[PDB]
Structures are given as C-alpha cells and as structure tokens.
Amino acid sequence: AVKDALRLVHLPSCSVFSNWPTSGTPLGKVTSVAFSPSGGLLAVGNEQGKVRLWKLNHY
Amino acid sequence: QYKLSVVSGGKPALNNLSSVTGNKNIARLSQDQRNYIIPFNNQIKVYSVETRQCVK
Amino acid sequence: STARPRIITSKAPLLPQQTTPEQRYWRQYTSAQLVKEHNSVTHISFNPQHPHDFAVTSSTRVQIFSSRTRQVIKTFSRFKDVVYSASFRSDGKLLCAGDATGLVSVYDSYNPRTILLSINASTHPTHVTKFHTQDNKILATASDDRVTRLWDISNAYEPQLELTGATDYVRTLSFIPAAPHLVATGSYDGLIRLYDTRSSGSTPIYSLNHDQPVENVIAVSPTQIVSCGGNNFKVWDLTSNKKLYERGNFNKAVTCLDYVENFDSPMQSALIASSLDGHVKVFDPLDNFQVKFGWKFSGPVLSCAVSPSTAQGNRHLVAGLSSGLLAIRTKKKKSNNFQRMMRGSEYQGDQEHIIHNDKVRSQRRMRAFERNINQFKWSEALDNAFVPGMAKELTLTVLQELRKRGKVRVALYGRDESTLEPLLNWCLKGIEDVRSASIVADWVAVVLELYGNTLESSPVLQELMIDLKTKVRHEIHKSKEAQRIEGMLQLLT
Amino acid sequence: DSPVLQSAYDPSGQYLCYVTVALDKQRVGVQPTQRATWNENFLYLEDSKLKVTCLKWVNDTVAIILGMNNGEIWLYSVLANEVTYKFTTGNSYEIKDIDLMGNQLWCIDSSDAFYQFDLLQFKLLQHFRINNCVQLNKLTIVPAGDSVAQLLVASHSISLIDIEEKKVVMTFPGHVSPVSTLQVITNEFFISGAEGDRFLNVYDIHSGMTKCVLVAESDIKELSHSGQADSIAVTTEDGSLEIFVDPLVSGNKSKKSSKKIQIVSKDGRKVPIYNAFINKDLLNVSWLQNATMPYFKNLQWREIPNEYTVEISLNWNNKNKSADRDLHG
Amino acid sequence: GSIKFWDFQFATLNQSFKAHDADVLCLTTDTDNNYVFSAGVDRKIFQFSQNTNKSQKNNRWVNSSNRLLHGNDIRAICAYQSKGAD
Amino acid sequence: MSLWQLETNSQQFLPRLNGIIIDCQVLGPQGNYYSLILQMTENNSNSDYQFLLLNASDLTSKLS
Amino acid sequence: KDANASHPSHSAIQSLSFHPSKPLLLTGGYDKTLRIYHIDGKTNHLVTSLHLVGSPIQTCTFYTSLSNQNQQNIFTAGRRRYMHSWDLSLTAKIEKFSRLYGHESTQRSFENFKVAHLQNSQTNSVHGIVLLQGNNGWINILHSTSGLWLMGCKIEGVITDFCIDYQPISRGKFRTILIAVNAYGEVWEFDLNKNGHVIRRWKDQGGVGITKIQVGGGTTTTCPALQISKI
Amino acid sequence: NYDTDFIFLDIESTLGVVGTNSDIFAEQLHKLSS
RNA sequence: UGCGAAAGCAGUUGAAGACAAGUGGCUUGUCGUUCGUUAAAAUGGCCU
C-alpha cells in the first residue's frame, strides 16, 4: 500500500530488526516477497517491476 | 517381375470375447509411462505419448 | 471430443437474379438528396487532391459542395451569362470555368472573391474548360468556334496552341493519361480528333469515327479511351486506332461518362454513364464493359460524377438532371495510480521466449431455437420457431432440423388448440413457397394424423384447416399449370 | 558477464568440467561435449564462501583436482559424486594454480609458496619458496618425461625454475598485468597471455627470446593449442574465437588471427563462446544455451571460411505448438 | 434446492448436496438417523443415507435415492418408525 | 463419457467422442489418463474400434 | 544484483517463488508472462520465459512432488476461470485446469490458490493438491495432476486467506491441515487427509480486518520438503 | 496409385501392394545420469 | 428374406427344452437355450 513497507521481525524474541531496511533501501512498493529454501536469500518484488535481491550472511 | 506384399497395418483387435465387460483393452502403458504398447491384428504398435508418433 | 457443429441454415438452390457483389456495393449508395437548382445542371467536377469537394455548374453560378455535409460551402456567382464548364486543377488549387460569352475565368478554389485571371477566348460560347492532367500550367478550352485552344496561364493573351480541324461544335476535351502531348477532342460531327501538340496542331494525327455526334470522351487506360454520343458508347484502343467494344444499353443519348480506378470496391474499375432518359449505369471495364448496376432518376440526367479514387471518407455519386435539380447518393463509413497498478495488460509477448495461446475464439451467439435443440427441448424449439420476429429461412431450418434430427411427433405431442395455431398459421404462409412446402406438407400431415379429435372438438382450427385446404387448392392449380407450360415448351424443342 | 566461473576440458576434449554458482554455493559439473557417443548431478560445495580457484583434469579412474581457497586440493571422481581425497597444505592461503605430471602434483600458494604432492601416495612431499617471485598466480610444469624438473611460474613476469636447486634459471619479460594463460607449446616454446590484454607472446624456453607475438582483436579469456603446435585457438572477452593457424613459422613479428568464429542465433542475438577446444582438424566450441547449461558444437575448422558465423536455433518468439493439438487450437 | 449437513459444534458445513431443482420445503429423518428424506416444490422426494458402517464411522451421507410420486408439491413430510410400523 | 463424483453424485461430461464407449478405465498411478474404446457404429458392416486415451487434466485426446 | 535486472518485467511483480532444489526464481505479474531466472550473486540470468496470452497471472508456484521429486510443475493462475500448469522439461508442455467437477458456481476465479501435499492414508501414496479460495467460505481442493475435485471446506464468513500445515504421525505418514481465516478473525482448521472435516475452531485475539495468515518454522508451501521424512 | 503400383484392401483391413578409461566412463555416465 | 431401379415383383411368422406367473396336471408368457427356414417406457439426455 505504501512505499518501503517491509520489516523483518526476529523471533522467538518478537523484535523487529532495527538496522534493515534503512531509509535508502530501494524496496519500492513491496508487492511480493520470497525466501530462498537454502541460501538465506530474500527476493522483494515491487510495483515498478523489479525484483531486488539480498543475502542474509547468517546462512 | 511383379511381387505381392502386405505393407500397411490393420485393425487394433481388442479382446473379442463375450462375458468380459470392463477390461477388454489389452493395450498397456509403460512403467516409465512414456510409450504406449497396443497390439494390432498384424503387429505390436508402440506409440509414444509425448510425440503421438509410432516409435517401434 | 469436438465442439458442437452449428445449426446450418437451410439454403435452397439459388434463384435467378441473385445479388452480385458489384450490385451490393453499388446499392449501398443511398440517402438521396434532391437539391433544386435554378436551371439544368450541365457539368459537375470533383476536387482531385483532397478529393472531398465537388463543383456543380448550374446556370450563371458554380457551387462547391462539401462531401461531408452536402451543403454548399462556397459559390461563384459573378458570371455574366450561363457558366458552362467548371473543373479543378490537378493540384486542386484553382478552378476554371468556361462561360457562354467565351470568357474563361479561373478563380482559386475555396475563395470565390479572387478571380485569378480571365482568359478572353473566342466570341462564341466556351463550352468546355479543363486543365492538363499531367501539366499544371496549361488549360484547354474548347468553344462553339470549332477550335480548341491550349493556354499557358502565365501568358494569358494569345493561346499557346490552337487546335483546329473540326467541322462542327467541339464539346469535349480529354487528355491521354500517360503521354502528356496527346489531346483527344470530340465534336458534334462524330469524329474524335486527337492531336500531338509538338506538331503543327492544325491537323489531328488520326480520327476515330464514332458515327453519332459525341457528347463526351474520357480516357480509361493510357491506351484506351471511351467516347459517348448517341445511344451507345464505344471504346477505342489508341495504340492501334481501333474500336473494340460498344455498349448501347440505353434509350436516349448518353450525355456523360466518368471513370474510377483502384478505389475500395469489388469492381477494380468502373465507368458510369448518364443518358438523358433517367438512367445512370455502371459498367465494369474488366469483363468487357458489362453493366453491373444502375439508378433511375426523376427526369433526364444531364451530367454525373463520383468521388475520386482516393476519397478516404464519405463517398459520393452525384447526378445533375436537365430538370434543374441535383441528386446525391452517398455511402458512409481511470487513474494514473490505477494504471500503474494494472500496468501490464497490453504486452502481448514480444521479448518472451515461448508464447502460449489457448484462448478459444468467441463464436457467434446462439439463437434460442439453436440452444433449445442443443438442450433437447424440442417442443420449446418449435415454440421458438413460431415467434413473430423470426426469419422465414430460420423457421424453415428449425423445422428441418427437427424433421431430420428427431421426431416431428415429439415436437408436436403435448399440444392442443391454443398451441397448434402458431404452426398452422405459419403453414398457411409457408405452403405458398417452393422451398418450404415439402416440410409444410409433412408437418401438416403429422399434425392431422395425431390431432384428428381436436379437429372435431375445436371449431377454431377447423376453419384453419379449411383455409389450408383452399391454399393447397390454389397451389395445386399452380403446380398443375406449371407442368402445362413445361409441356407446351417441351413441344418447341 | 558469464555465469561459468571456471571451466576446462579433459585432454581429447571429450568432457567439460565447469564450476558455476548456484544460489550462493559453488557447484562443479561435467558434461560430455558430444551426446552421440544431460548429466544432472553436481558436486556441491557445502560452504557459502568456499570456492574453486583452479581445476585440472587428471588422466585410469578419471578425476578432477579442484584447487580451493582454503589451502586444499580436492580430488573428485566424476563417475561417483564425492571428493575422493582432500590434499591440504599447512596453511589457510588460497591456492592460485596447480598442475600435474604423471602422478606428481604441484601447486602454488597465495603466500608464493610451492607445494608438491604425490597422487600415488597422498602425501605432501616438498614445501619451499624462492626469492624475487612474490605475486605468483600461474605455474606450468615444463615436460621432460617422468622428470618434473623446470617449473615455469608467472607473476606478471614468467620465471623458469629448477626444482633441484629451488632457484630461478631464466627470467622472461612478462606483461604489464598478471598472466592469465601460461602454457607449454613445444619442447622449446611456451605461450603466455595476461589479464585484460589481447596479446599473447610465445617465448623460447631455452634462450629467453620472444619468438613472436600473437594479436587477438579482443581481450583473451582462454586458449587451447592443438597437440602438435600447428594451431592455437583463443577465446576472447566478446565471446569470439580466433584461430592462429601455424603460428610458429615466418605477420612476421606479430601475427593476427587467421580465422574468427562467432555464434549468432536465428534472431540476431550474438551468444558468446566461452572455452573452446581444438585438435587436428576438429574444433569444439562451447556456449550456454539457457542461463547456465552448456551446449557444444564440433567444427572442421580447416575448411570453414575465415569470418565464420555459426547459426544456432534458439527460442525467441515461437508459438507454443503443442503436439496434441493442431494449429487452429 | 441444495441440502446441507452442518456439524453443530464448530457450527460449520460438512457436506452440501445439490439435490432438488427448486425449493426444499420439508425434510425429516428416521429414529437412528440412518436416513434423511427431503421434498419440496419440484415434487421429488430425495433420500440421503448413512447406513453403511463406513458411512457411520466416516460421517458421510450419500445421496442414495430419489422418487417421483407426487403430482404438484410436497409441503409436509414426516416419519414414524416402530416395531410394526415404519 | 460421464464421470460421476460419487460423493455428491455430480457428473462431469465429455460429449462428442466419435464412437460409443464400449470400454473406459483410469490408467495412471495417480489416474492421470483415461483409456477408452470407441466403437464407431455408424457402419453396421464392420466392428471398427478407435483406441483413445486422453490425459485427465484438460480431457484432451492424448494419442488417439 | 537485482534478480530480474537481466530481463525487465513489464508489470508489477505479483508473485515470486524459488525452486525447492534448483537455483531458480520464478517471477510473474499482470503482463501475463512468467519468467524463470537462474539466480546467483553476480549475474542472475534468464533461464526461460513463457507468455500466456490473455491470462494475467497473480499466483505462480513451483510444485515438486514427494514421491520421486522429479516432476517440477509450475502452477500459475490469475483472475480467470482456469489455471495453467507447465511441466518443466528444459516448445513447452502446459495443461489447463478449467473444470470444477460440479462446483463452478462456488469458484469464479482461480486467483488465490496454494499447492500442498496430501497422503492417501490407506496407501502411503502422496499427491499434490491445489487449493482454490472461492466465494462464500469455500476452499475447493483438487488434484494437481488430474484436476479432479477431491473435497471442499467451507468456513463461515468472508474467506480472506488460508495456509497449509503438516504434522508427522509415524514413519512415512503425515497429516495435512488447512487453516482458513474469516475476515472477522475466527480461524478454522480442517483435517483433510481424511474427509475435509473440522478439528479445531478458534479466534484471533484482536484483529478485525484480517488479510493474511501464514505458518512457519517447519514445512510451509514456500519452504517445501523434498523428502517425506523431512516434513 | 499413380507411380506404377497397385494397392489392395484386405477384408481385415491390411493394405497390401503388388509392385515391380573414456569409453567405460562414457557408458557408466550415460548409465548414472539417466 | 430374394430379385431389383430410386417404383415394384415372389416368400412368410415352425419345432424342441427349460423357467416364471396364474388356477402333479392345465393355461399364458418369457429365454445372456437348441434345431430348422433364403427369412416403448427405472423422471432417465451431451463439459468447462
């Protein structure tokens, strides 16, 4: 509905990560999201037609 | 110099028995079900369900 | 599994005088306008370039009509005597008009107030004035002086060429459409003369003997030209100096011709001809100048024209009558946020590797009888036959589909007096026609086979059976007397 | 840029080993270069940051040695799907190049160390390092039979090394950038080519003198030479292939390419060639048809024209014609 | 015309049958609820059965049968079942 | 060829199969094909059978 | 690198799914095409790309069966009365599901589907089900290979979303639970390895306009199990 | 038929006519990758 | 059924046995029975 509206909430602690996404993450108007089953890897598709890709270095 | 041959196939020829309802279809699928083995009255045709061609 | 076959509408063997494609196209020229002029409409030309306006020469005025409103946009009234000819230049930029005092006056089109130059031709009336069709700056005027003149419109004092040689009343010019040195002129002694303009010009190179006094000569090909005069028109091959067709399909003298090429039509070319008895006819130059369509008008038609080859809009056939009136028949022709949300719906697969297509085509809507025959509602299909707004071939095809398909009796089982009267009341009308009467025969035979007791009870279908009896009596007298005519011309073999 | 990170043929050019990334982990696969004689199972590197830095076909259980970036040479059989043996140095330094002669594996380290292993004994035989060779990223064994004397090591500047004395016996002027191919052509010549330049040079391994310079018309990625020095096919950065035919004859000091091959599709899209293989009269080129799956082509390179444009059939707008349905749907 | 069976606890549908062609005015059952009979303005009487042991252990009615006996409608239906009357 | 959903007694049809169905059976492990024998009885002078399996997904004649 | 940066999309990207095993990412949107990208770090290239004409897609899912893990179907669907199923074979053989086997009135659009695994529970034979969210409260569950309507589960209210939970039972047997939410906040759980019967009905504490439920921490439809013992 | 043959149709419809290291690695890899 | 033309022209329609119903027989009717002759109906209709 609005731009850049994505949060990653850690759990069991139920606390939102406060360092990502920042004000300069090109998330766009987030209209889909997907997690990789093995790589630890987000894909975030927005209304402009762009899948942006991030890797979580814990995995 | 003239010779006779039979070159082209015939009818499929299922089980022509009475007193068998249901399974009179003697054609089979493969286990890796990519080709379909049907008998004829002249031969065994083996079609392929992917390409609809007779392969053997 | 397949799709369901559509119910095929019963077509009989074709009767004579079917609707040809040529006459379907020429019959959709309709919505006639009749404009009463002050005198007989003698000439009518069209603008070539934006081919969308036409000039009508009545007496002592020339009116340009528009081809979208059919009202007079502009008018030229400052002639002293009867204006005779008025044609547009090939660029459509200016308009020449020959006048009964032998004063050719050329204005510019779409500006009646600026007379551009007044060529003072012969003291006799000048009856035909037209620019060259290849060249732009030469104007050919023939007059009642038995001599045509080619005028350069720069030097408008002496004619640059003086084509004499004709013995009586030259009334038509024409130019040959590929060789620009070649002027074919036509006079009231017959004898289409034609001149090479690089030569002397006081002698034609040859002459074509139309026997009647010609009224018009037009050029169809670069090779063949058509001259009308008298009750016929003739066509002449020009490379071989020789006549090759003549059509005399009129009662009175053919007054004018014109010709169309390459326009949107089943006919690739069309010559139409106007003939002082009411008729304008269209002839097809590709099958031997055979007539394909015609119009009859309310008096003797003096001149005619059609919209030119590149008309691109509302298309016109105009005919001006000697009665003093003008007949035109035309054929006509959410949010930026929401769009950004629903962006992709117009893409149609350009950069994409594989392109899949299994959207089925949407077929024509099924009528109620066809979907009832599909749903096996056979009595409801008969009921849907006998509604009033049904075509006669549609009632016939649902009767024939119920006859071939299942059972007349199934379609007729649960009926009584009030629900049989549509069938028999249509069978009265269908017994007259040849194509229906076999089906009407067996349907009436079945319904009197299985409703012979309702015949006794209800008196208000007894009278329907009696009317049907007199109908079959008239039809059997007709089918007997047709066999008598068949024998009486079998005798004459 | 290409998804195929590393790739090499076996000798005789019958199989191609190739390392590509698969969703943050390296995977090593082997494809036959002609099917007329898919292979859908890979070796998977299980760590997200362990990656292959070099690879070499051994010659007879057939295997690959994959030089990793943690001081290990994995030895991986291809018919089975496990690393059969894990050579390790004493360090964590990434290894820049390996080679083998017979059963004697040699390798270079990012700390400019030389290690020797024995494939028949699975043991680290020697470890040393030599002076004034400090940025090494290629080694090549100069062949003298079963004797594995004379390594040939590059650091932007090729140096010939006697291993009995562990010392440098010749010094070749290399390039202005790190050497990316360093291969022995004959028993007296070796070719070398650097990163980001389009100039190979062939040196005389007995004198130090450069015999000739070979000039590609784009920056060279890989090279292959036919086994008798008669032809050298290099593959460049713009996806083209350039064949120098008989480069070791008397276009006297620097020779251009004799033949140039590129591949276009039926559309006009130019696919890139990576990593071809040449032999006597036979040339096998490789590309990627879909995103990461290698396709091959054999060519009689002696009878093609000079500027040859291979055409491949590739899906661009083709209507999905299903075999169970006619064209009208 | 649809006839639906709803689990009382959880208050929710188990299965729906599309039985009649118009309204279902009246429906009834027997003593041990092995049958449910139903009827309405389309003038057929439908019977929904659960008599099989698998039907009773799976809670699955089947649309067993259907009879056309009435002339115009059925506005009332009832059932009696005793030792000498069913 | 009708197939009766035995829960709700609900037919799904396949209506114009150029022959009467004298044998039909499911075929696959998951039942993804139907094999049919169609007797094509407009000619009474011969018993001419068409063998037609078809995939159960879109009910299209795979390999007639 | 942005995954669809190699080949741009002509619409908003409406759905997005990774492969269960391969390094593939399937994107798809209202420009009625669906694209597969081999993803890695550097160069996310385009594997293949299929443009279904006249069928804008809204949900697209990699399905991979549990028996042989060799099918690799892609199920895709939008605001249409059909749903396509591409069988991955590296021409392209896709089939179309367009028959609700008697239940077309309660399913007028195939938009919101989810794909899941189901066990026969008299054999140890699993098969994929697609689950369609319909009008009244209905979820129509149907076979992912034959398209036969297996069962239906009706909740009471405005169905807004649903998810699939699995729970293991023994060696090689698991049980599939459909979890469907009203708009108001009350949640039904249906056991559907038997007939689609309710086992639990609870209520969300707070929550009045409910758009999306999801489970996680085990095998969801977006983290799928490749092997039946890994459920 | 129009090229000097004669076709005939049997009553059981048979149409007849009257006329005028690396090798073992390759084998085991095509085994183990199929 | 045979010969025919699409009209028509010649030929008909027996026996055995078993079973069912009705009143061991008698009557009637059937036959996934045989020999001889060239010889209307279970509310039940067509996909997306």
Curated annotation (Swiss-Prot), chain A:
Organism domain of life: Eukaryota
Repeat region (WD), residues: 25-58
Compartment list: Nucleus, Nucleolus
Signal sequence interval, chain numbering: none
Family affiliation: Belongs to the WD repeat UTP18 family.
Protein role: Involved in nucleolar processing of pre-18S ribosomal RNA and ribosome assembly.
Additional facts recorded: Present with 9570 molecules/cell in log phase SD medium.
Assembly notes: Interacts with snoRNA U3. Interacts with MPP10, UTP21 and UTP25. Component of the ribosomal small subunit (SSU) processome composed of at least 40 protein subunits and snoRNA U3.
Name of this protein: U3 small nucleolar RNA-associated protein 18
Organism, scientific name: Saccharomyces cerevisiae (strain ATCC 204508 / S288c) (Baker's yeast)
Lineage of producing organism: Eukaryota, Fungi, Dikarya, Ascomycota, Saccharomycotina
Gene: UTP18
Segment of the intact protein contained: 536 to 594 of 594
Swiss-Prot record, chain C:
Keywords of this entry: Nucleus, Repeat, Ribonucleoprotein, Ribosome biogenesis, rRNA processing, Transcription, WD repeat
GO molecular function, one term: U3 snoRNA binding
WD repeat windows: 36-77, 78-117, 123-161, 165-205, 209-246, 249-293
Chief place of localization: nucleus
Keyword flag Oxidoreductase: no
PANTHER family documented for this protein: U3 SMALL NUCLEOLAR RNA-ASSOCIATED PROTEIN 15 HOMOLOG, UTP15 U3 SMALL NUCLEOLAR RNA-ASSOCIATED PROTEIN 15 FAMILY MEMBER
General function of this protein: Involved in nucleolar processing of pre-18S ribosomal RNA. Required for optimal pre-ribosomal RNA transcription by RNA polymerase I together with a subset of U3 proteins required for transcription (t-UTPs).
Any further remark recorded for this protein: Present with 358 molecules/cell in log phase SD medium.
Protein name per its UniProtKB record: U3 small nucleolar RNA-associated protein 15
Source species taxonomy: Eukaryota, Fungi, Dikarya, Ascomycota, Saccharomycotina
Swiss-Prot record, chain E:
Subcellular location per the Swiss-Prot or TrEMBL entry: Nucleus, Nucleolus
Organism field: Saccharomyces cerevisiae (strain ATCC 204508 / S288c)
Misc: Present with 5440 molecules/cell in log phase SD medium.
Designated name of the protein: U3 small nucleolar RNA-associated protein 4
WD repeats: 12-49
Assembly behavior: Interacts with snoRNA U3. Interacts with MPP10. Component of the ribosomal small subunit (SSU) processome composed of at least 40 protein subunits and snoRNA U3. In the absence of snoRNA3, forms a complex with other t-UTPs. This complex can associate with pre-18S ribosomal RNAs.
Protein purpose: Involved in nucleolar processing of pre-18S ribosomal RNA. Required for optimal pre-ribosomal RNA transcription by RNA polymerase I together with a subset of U3 proteins required for transcription (t-UTPs).
UniProtKB/Swiss-Prot annotation, chain H:
Subunit structure of this chain's protein: Interacts with snoRNA U3. Interacts with MPP10. Component of the ribosomal small subunit (SSU) processome composed of at least 40 protein subunits and snoRNA U3. In the absence of snoRNA3, forms a complex with other t-UTPs. This complex can associate with pre-18S ribosomal RNAs.
Note: Present with 6560 molecules/cell in log phase SD medium.
Role played: Involved in nucleolar processing of pre-18S ribosomal RNA. Required for optimal pre-ribosomal RNA transcription by RNA polymerase I together with a subset of U3 proteins required for transcription (t-UTPs).
Compartments it resides in: Nucleus, Nucleolus
Protein name: NET1-associated nuclear protein 1
Annotated source species: Saccharomyces cerevisiae (strain ATCC 204508 / S288c) (Baker's yeast)
UniProt feature coiled coil, ranges: none
Full-sequence range covered: 769 to 831 of 896
